[PDB]
């Protein structure tokens, strides 16, 4: 659980109010963000249109963005607009870091993004610049075994007490929300909706960060609904609360594949419908590390193919990293439809010990166990 006391966010008062028209809004919004009083927000309201069309924006420390009901902040469908180097974006190669995110918050304290407007990434729209859309680059990347360069919606780095509240995030070209190398992130009443077939669209991913709360939110996307990660040479990921949520399509409430120190994760009251994986802890030989103190409770799943997944050899990658996963508990977890539980502890020195209290799976469900002991 998050070590902070976290209560429902309050929306900041506006410093400036902008009205949408048919012109490109990037510099108009950036200028407003650059002269906004600490603790206030730039407010995006309707004008002649209700859509603010923009390229990359930077969110200053202590400043927030407020998007009105019915208003959309939409990412331009242009690869050159998001590049960080000549021709680095909207291509498939050995990079993967060729595009800036739509909204980036670097070294911020008390910054935030508020709705109930929408942020639309236009992931599935043909680019003005290329023959394909952002999502169409994944097939190519997968089949060619390389990396696509597409923009993330919200990228937060080295920040403190960032807030994401009462807002909708749709059609993200890449991951929707990333909170990296920081401390204090609260996502509350956050709605994420991206097609189940769109690859590389993780919902909310804390990366080597501490003190995270994801509550009263609704996440339906293509890849991981939530993916908790910790990287070698960076901070440990600790103290996380995932409470009172609803997950739709996606790859699950996951931890990994980068598991270099993930501690004290509390998941309670989670409704899942159609997610391909339910509760997951995954890694491989290239990024496995310590995962300790993970507790799942009051989880109800419907139409989830793999309700519980603990896999230490998810993909076959080279490396000598060994998973040291312990103190993992499941309590009051129900799966209403036929599915498979995968428990694989290959590459772990000793059998992974897991506790399952009142875990009810249908009678036609299968358990695939390898080097892991289940205590009841």
What is the C-alpha separation between 58 and 37, in angstroms, rounded?
Answer: 15
150: which 2 tokens?
């597409």
159: which 2 tokens?
């920040």
Neighbours of 55 (CB within 10 A): 20
Q: What is the CATH number of the domain that holds 151?
A: 2.160.20.10
Method in brief: X-ray
Place of tokens 């139409």: 303
Q: What is the 3-state secondary structure (H, E, C) of the chain?
A: CCCCCCCCCCCCCEEEEEECCCCECHHHHHHHHCCCCCCCEEEEECCCCCEEEECCEECCCCCEEEECCCCEEEECCCCHHHECCCCCCCCEECCCCCECCCEEEECCECCEEECCCEEECCCCCCCCCCCCCCCHHHHHHHHHCCEECCCCCEEEECCEEEEEEEEEEECCCCCCEEEECCEEEEEEEEEEECCCCCCCCCCEEEECCEEEEEECCEEECCCCCEEEEECCCCCCEEEEEEEEEEECCCCCEEEEEEECCEEEEEEEEEEEECCCEEEEEECCCCCCCEEEEEEEEEEEEECCCEEEEEECCCCCCCCCCCCEEEEEEEEEEEECCCCEEEEECCCCCCCEEEEEEEEECCCCCEEEEECEEEEC
Neighbours of 79 (CB within 10 A): 25
Could you tell me which residues come within 8 angstroms of residue 330 by beta carbon, excluding any fewer than 6 positions away?
279, 296, 297, 299, 308, 354, 355, 356, 357, 359
Bond into 128 cis (ω within 30): no
- Distance of CA 132 to CAs 138, 172, 361, Å? 11, 15, 43
What is the C-alpha separation between 332 and 204, in angstroms, rounded?
Answer: 25
What is the C-alpha separation between 25 and 57, in angstroms, rounded?
Answer: 10
How many folded domains does the chain comprise? 1
Q: Rg (Cα) of the chain, in Å, rounded?
A: 21
Catalytic residue among 2, 251, 284, 311: 251
Phi, psi at residue 293, to the nearest 5°?
Answer: 75, 70
Neighbours of 63 (CB within 10 A): 25
Neighbours of 87 (CB within 10 A): 12
What is the C-alpha separation between 198 and 251, in angstroms, rounded?
Answer: 11
- Distance of CA 98 to CAs 76, 79, 198, Å? 16, 10, 19
Region of residue 250 (phi > 0: left; psi between -120 and 50: alpha; otherwise: beta): left
- Distance of CA 289 to CAs 1, 185, 210, Å? 20, 23, 17
Could you tell me which residues come within 8 angstroms of residue 224 by beta carbon, excluding any fewer than 6 positions away?
202, 203, 205, 250, 251, 252, 254
Catalytic residue among 183, 202, 205, 223: 223
**What sign does the CA torsion over 337, 376, 238, 347 have?**
negative
What is the C-alpha separation between 125 and 127, in angstroms, rounded?
Answer: 6
Q: Is 251 a catalytic residue?
A: yes
What is the C-alpha separation between 277 and 270, in angstroms, rounded?
Answer: 13
Instruction: Answer for the pair 209, 240: CB distance below 8 angstroms, yes or no.
Output: no
Closest to 257 measured CA to CA, from 277, 241, 239: 277
Could you tell me which residues come within 8 angstroms of residue 327 by beta carbon, excluding any fewer than 6 positions away?
292, 293, 294
Q: Which domain holds residue 13?
A: 1-376
Neighbours of 47 (CB within 10 A): 15
What is the C-alpha separation between 277 and 341, in angstroms, rounded?
Answer: 9
């Amino acid at each position: 659980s998050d070590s902070r006391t976290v209560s429902e966010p309050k929306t900041p008062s506006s410093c400036t109010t902008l009205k949408a028209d048919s012109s490109t809004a990037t510099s108009t919004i950036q200028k407003a963000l650059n002269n906004c009083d600490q603790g206030k927000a730039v407010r995006l309201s309707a004008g002649s249109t209700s859509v603010f069309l923009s390229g990359p924006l930077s969110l200053p420390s202590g400043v927030s963005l407020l998007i009105d009901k019915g208003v959309t902040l939409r990412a331009v469908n242009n690869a050159k607009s998001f590049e960080n180097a000549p021709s680095s974006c909207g291509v498939v190669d050995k990079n993967g870091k060729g595009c800036d995110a739509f909204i980036t918050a670097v070294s911020t304290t008390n910054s935030g993004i508020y709705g109930p407007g929408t942020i639309d990434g236009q992931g599935g729209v043909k680019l003005q610049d290329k023959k394909v859309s952002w999502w169409e680059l994944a097939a190519d990347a997968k089949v060619k075994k390389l990396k696509q360069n597409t923009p993330r919606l919200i990228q937060i780095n080295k920040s403190k007490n960032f807030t994401l509240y009462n807002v909708s995030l749709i059609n993200s070209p890449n991951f929707h929300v990333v909170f990296s190398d920081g401390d204090g992130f609260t996502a509350w009443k956050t709605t994420i909706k991206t097609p189940s077939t769109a690859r590389n669209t993780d919902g909310i991913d804390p990366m080597s960060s501490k003190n995270i709360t994801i509550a009263y939110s609704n996440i339906a996307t293509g890849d991981d609904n939530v993916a908790i990660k910790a990287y070698k040479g960076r901070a440990e990921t600790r103290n996380i609360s995932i409470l009172h949520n609803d997950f739709g399509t996606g790859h699950g409430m996951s931890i990994g594949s980068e598991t270099m120190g993930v501690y004290n994760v509390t998941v309670d009251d989670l409704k899942m419908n159609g997610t391909t994986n339910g509760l997951r802890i995954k890694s491989d030989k290239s990024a496995a590390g310590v995962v300790n103190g993970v507790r799942y409770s009051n989880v109800v799943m419907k139409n989830v193919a793999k309700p519980i997944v603990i896999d230490t050899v998810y993909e076959k990658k080279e490396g000598s990293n060994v998973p040291d996963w312990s103190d993992i508990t499941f309590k009051d977890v129900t799966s209403e439809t036929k599915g498979v539980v995968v428990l694989n502890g290959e590459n772990a020195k000793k059998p992974i010990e897991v506790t399952m209290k009142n875990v009810k799976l249908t009678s036609d469900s299968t358990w695939q166990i390898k080097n892991v002991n289940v205590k009841k």
